[PDB]
Each structure stands twice: as structure tokens, then as C-alpha cells.
């Protein structure tokens, strides 16, 4: 079983460097070229470069020519990839990937987030979205919750403790301009149901060690 | 120096029919093109490589074909399981990537506002929040209006995934106002839709 177990997300100020391991196993690491691969948050693939593992020798792609370093440590099977002088714009899931004999890349590391901002790490602030007649269509009310100013990415939901998972609709956060992500939290539930059972939404920002529980009651 | 094209962007294709994407290159007798899926929050899969080799464990609905410069990825019978992203690569070189999505009939929007809660007016600022849910297909016009003042340029949109149940989108739109400007007036969601006869419109006074 071929594995490629990419080190954890982090948050970095423009200005530094990021360095992002990826620990093979599971095959013979010298064999194969492993390939750095990164994708911006909504955004397409783009290769780094590559490193043979066998010699050290690397290439890189013009546009990081000069900023990216790639090592490896064959003794524990271990490819690194080192970002410079980072800037927000190298925000991205950044993936390892060994190339294969048809030169496709066959198995990839799971990706670590790297934020490039000047943010500090915030936990969000969460606000009910509450039914009312306002939010009552035919029987059903829509109810919610909003996670408002958090850095960095990301942040989970679930309501009743994960008991309520029908009709949940979690949204993608949007990045303001402040630098904080947001994002809402709604569920729709029968409108007979808000006199009587309790609506609880949990949020969890692991980044900051922040986990809110908020009841969202009617009117 | 090579450049991969990917046509089109996004793709809806109905439950069970036939979906295919197009992957033209800028350019042993081999291809060296590979299609990846992807979903959110995984690294991408190898679907095919060589042009036309399915990875093994692949469902055989995939297939790749095409020479030269010009590869097509096939979806037959669509699954809402394949709602994804896929990517083409050549050596170095990936496409931009087509977003696959499940065709369905038309859903209108249900549409619930929320108004600021105290809680937030406390800490300075003043969210509204315009609900549309359970709808299709993911266009929809969302106009903020205040005092009847069309809002324009001052909220944020976010679209969910495509719903694997209901192959539906929700949406929110939120319009933030400090406080301030907040307590200055008196606040409406309109919304227009292709499932909508007429636009619906949900609005509650601050107070």
C-alpha cells in the first residue's frame, strides 16, 4: 500500500518561508521522481517541480525558480518542499505527488494548506439565524448560524452535536477584506418543530482551539 | 511551454446519461495525457492515463480517448458520485479544469431572511442574511434593497456544492452594515430565479 503523508496546514506572514514534507511509503522511495503540486482555494493545478529522490537533483518551474528548494531525506523515505519569500498569493493546498512509469501522477500526499496573510489566528464569532415568520415557507422554517471573522480556514459545523444532519447546508467561508473568513450555517426543519425541539449549532476552529455552541430559538 | 485548454468549464449532464470533457494541448508512440477527478478537500485521482488506460478500480463508465493534440474524457451514465472537478495533464502541464454537475429539473428557490441578531448589533456590526434554498439551476438574482434603495456592490454571495441528495444548490447572500448605517434605515431580499413565475421578495423592519 503506497502512502504519501504530507506534514499539517500552516499559516505564514508574507515575507517567510514554508517548508512541507511528504513521507512515502509503501513502494521504494529512490525509484520515482516526486513531484510538488499546488492548488490555490477555487483554483486549478499547478506543478512546482520535481526531485529525484535517487540523486537530490531537482527542477522547478520558472515561476518559482529561485524560491523553491526541494530535498529529501532517503533514510526516512522524505521529500521536502521549501517556499521563500511567500507572499498571499502562495496560499494553497500544496500536494506531493509520485510520478509513475506513464508519467501521470498516480499517488498523491493528502495536501497541507498553507495561508499566506498578515492575520493573526481568530476565532469566529457566532450569531443565530433566527426563525421567524420571516424565514417560513409552507410548513418548513429555515434557521441557521453565522461564523463571522475567523482566520485561518478552516471551520466545521454540525448541529444538534451531528444528530441533525437533514436539510444542513454549511457555506463556503468568503475571505473579507479585513483578511477574516466568514460563513453561515442553515438548516430547515419543520416549522412545528420550533416550539418544541432545540436547535444547537456547533462550531469548531480547530486553528484557533475555538469551539462555540449556539441554541438558535425562534423569533 | 505547453499549454492545456479544457472545454467546457462546467458541464451539467442528467442522472444516468452521458457526460464528456475536452482536453486540447499546445504540443515510443505514446500519449502521456492523464484525467484526474477531484472532489472538495482531496488531493486529485488518476482516472486515466496514456490517453485512454483506465487506472485499475476506475468504474469502467470512465474512458479516455484522443491523439495528437486533442483528448476527450467520457462519463457514461453519470452518477451523482462523479460530481466533481477533472483536470487533464500533460508531463508538467494541467488544464484548468471542468466542473461536473448533475442536470435536473427546475427548483425554485424557498427564500427566509434573518435580520441582525442583538448579539452582533452589540459587537458593532449588522449582518442580513438572504436564504435560497434547495434550488436549481445555480443562476439566481439576489437584489438587497433598503428603505427600497437597491443595493448594489455591499453583500457577498456563497453557493453550496451540489446537493448529492436532491442535486439542488442553496445559497446565502449576506449584507453587512455597521451598525450604524444599519440603525439609519428601516430591509428586503427580491429574488429572481428561472423557477420563480414572479420574483419573491422577503423583508422585515428593523425593530
Known amino acids: 500500500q503506497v502512502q504519501l503523508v504530507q506534514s499539517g496546514a500552516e499559516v505564514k506572514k508574507p515575507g517567510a518561508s514554508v517548508k512541507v514534507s511528504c513521507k512515502a511509503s509503501?513502494?521504494?522511495?529512490?525509484?520515482?521522481?516526486m513531484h510538488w503540486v499546488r492548488q490555490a482555494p477555487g483554483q486549478g493545478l499547478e506543478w512546482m517541480g520535481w526531485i529525484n529522490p535517487n540523486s537530490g537533483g531537482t527542477n522547478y518551474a520558472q515561476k518559482f525558480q529561485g524560491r523553491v528548494t526541494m530535498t529529501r531525506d532517503t533514510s526516512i523515505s522524505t521529500a521536502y518542499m521549501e517556499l521563500s519569500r511567500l507572499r498571499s498569493d502562495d496560499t494553497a493546498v500544496y500536494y506531493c505527488?509520485?510520478?509513475?512509469?506513464?508519467?501521470?501522477?498516480?499517488?498523491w500526499g493528502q495536501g497541507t494548506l498553507v495561508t499566506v496573510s498578515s492575520a493573526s489566528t481568530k476565532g469566529p464569532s457566532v450569531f443565530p439565524l433566527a426563525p421567524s415568520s420571516k424565514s417560513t415557507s409552507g410548513g418548513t422554517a429555515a434557521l441557521g448560524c453565522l461564523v463571522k471573522d475567523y482566520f485561518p480556514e478552516p471551520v466545521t459545523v454540525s448541529w444538534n452535536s451531528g444528530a441533525l444532519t437533514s436539510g444542513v447546508h454549511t457555506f463556503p467561508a468568503v475571505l473579507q477584506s479585513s483578511g477574516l473568513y466568514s460563513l453561515s450555517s442553515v438548516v430547515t426543519v419543520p416549522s412545528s418543530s420550533l416550539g418544541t425541539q432545540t436547535y444547537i449549532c456547533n462550531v469548531n476552529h480547530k486553528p484557533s482551539n475555538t469551539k462555540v455552541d449556539k441554541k438558535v430559538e425562534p423569533k | 511551454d505547453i499549454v492545456m485548454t479544457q472545454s467546457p468549464d462546467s458541464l451539467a449532464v442528467s442522472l444516468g446519461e452521458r457526460a464528456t470533457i475536452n482536453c486540447k494541448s499546445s504540443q515510443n508512440n505514446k500519449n502521456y495525457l492523464a484525467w484526474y477527478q477531484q472532489k472538495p478537500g482531496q488531493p486529485p485521482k488518476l482516472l486515466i492515463y496514456?490517453?485512454?488506460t483506465r487506472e485499475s478500480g476506475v468504474p469502467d463508465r470512465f474512458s479516455g480517448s484522443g491523439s495528437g493534440t486533442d483528448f476527450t474524457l467520457t462519463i457514461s451514465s453519470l452518477q451523482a458520485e462523479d460530481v466533481a472537478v477533472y483536470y487533464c495533464q500533460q508531463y508538467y502541464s494541467f488544464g484548468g479544469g471542468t466542473k461536473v454537475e448533475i442536470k435536473r429539473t427546475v427548483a425554485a428557490p424557498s427564500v427566509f431572511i434573518f435580520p441582525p441578531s442583538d448579539e452582533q448589533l452589540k459587537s458593532g456590526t449588522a449582518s442580513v442574511v438572504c436564504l435560497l434554498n434547495n434550488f436549481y439551476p445555480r443562476e439566481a438574482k439576489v437584489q438587497w434593497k433598503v428603505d427600497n434603495a437597491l443595493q448594489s456592490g455591499n453583500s457577498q454571495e456563497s453557493v453550496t456544492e451540489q446537493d448529492s441528495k436532491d442535486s439542488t444548490y442553496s445559497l446565502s447572500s449576506t449584507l453587512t452594515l455597521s451598525k450604524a448605517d444599519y440603525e439609519k434605515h428601516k430591509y428586503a431580499c427580491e429574488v429572481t430565479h428561472q423557477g420563480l413565475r414572479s420574483p419573491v421578495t422577503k423583508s422585515f423592519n428593523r425593530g
Open positions: 505527488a509520485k510520478i509513475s512509469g506513464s508519467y501521470s501522477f498516480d499517488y
Open positions: 496514456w490517453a485512454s
Open positions: 509503501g513502494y521504494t522511495f529512490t525509484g520515482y521522481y
